[PDB]
């Protein structure tokens, strides 16, 4: 967990499961489950600290995880449709979420709420 490549430092989180999310649109939940298994399993972060919030964690992490996965990527051999970005908006959002309630309760170690 140390600058992945060009990263500004970012950590790496472990490798999660690939969620169940429902987007309010029938074909966005059949399309996500016909490729539930394709999308990442893992996320990028940085270490949240007093200056940090979860609006810059969680914000900065589904942009740096794109960053290293749809820039790092379709660059490469993919063509990710800005549908399939849009599903990992939600992925990526509550891995980084889960990967937060983690590290940020590390962070704090009392300041976590008293």
Same mark, same amino acid.
């Given at each position: 967990g140390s600058v992945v490549g060009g990263l500004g430092g970012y950590m790496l989180g472990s490798a999660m499961s690939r969620p169940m999310i429902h987007f309010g649109n029938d074909w966005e939940d059949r399309y996500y489950r016909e490729n539930? $298994?394709? $999308?990442?399993n893992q996320v990028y972060y940085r270490p949240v600290d007093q200056g940090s919030n979860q609006n810059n964690f969680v914000h900065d992490c589904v942009n740096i995880t794109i960053k290293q996965h749809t820039v790092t990527t379709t660059t490469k051999?993919?063509?990710?449709t800005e549908t399939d970005v849009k599903m990992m908006e939600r992925v990526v959002e509550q891995m980084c979420v889960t990967q937060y309630q983690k590290e940020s309760q590390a962070y704090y170690d009392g300041r976590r709420s008293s």
């Open positions: 539930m $298994y394709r $999308y990442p051999g993919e063509n990710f």
